[PDB]
Design a protein around this nucleic acid. Structure first.
Length: 70
DNA sequence: GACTAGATCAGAAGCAGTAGAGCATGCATAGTTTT
């Protein structure tokens, strides 16, 4: 019901997944995904799946996010 | 396009079991020597 991951850790794990896919090593992808699964809650994992597939469906336009930012 | 995963065939290594050869133990029998 509670996670123990920070944003930097998640970015590092995703970077490892991408790089190891580029290098044709699936064991490291499995290890990174296992760490993410073991150190995350169900909601966090749902959002991680959405981020991996690259579709969040927030309902707010990218232009709106940029306008809010600056 | 590139790459991965599942299924399948062939060859090879491991293991089990039988056969064949070799090594040690003892004695049967006979021969030879001694009295």
């Amino acid at each position: 019901q509670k996670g123990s991951l920070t944003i930097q850790q998640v970015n590092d794990l995703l970077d490892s997944i991408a790089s190891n896919n580029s290098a044709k090593r699936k064991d490291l992808i499995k290890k990174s995904l296992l760490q993410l699964i073991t150190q995350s809650s169900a909601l966090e994992q749902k959002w991680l799946i959405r981020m991996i597939i690259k579709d969040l469906k927030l309902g707010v336009s990218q232009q709106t996010i940029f306008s809010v930012f600056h």
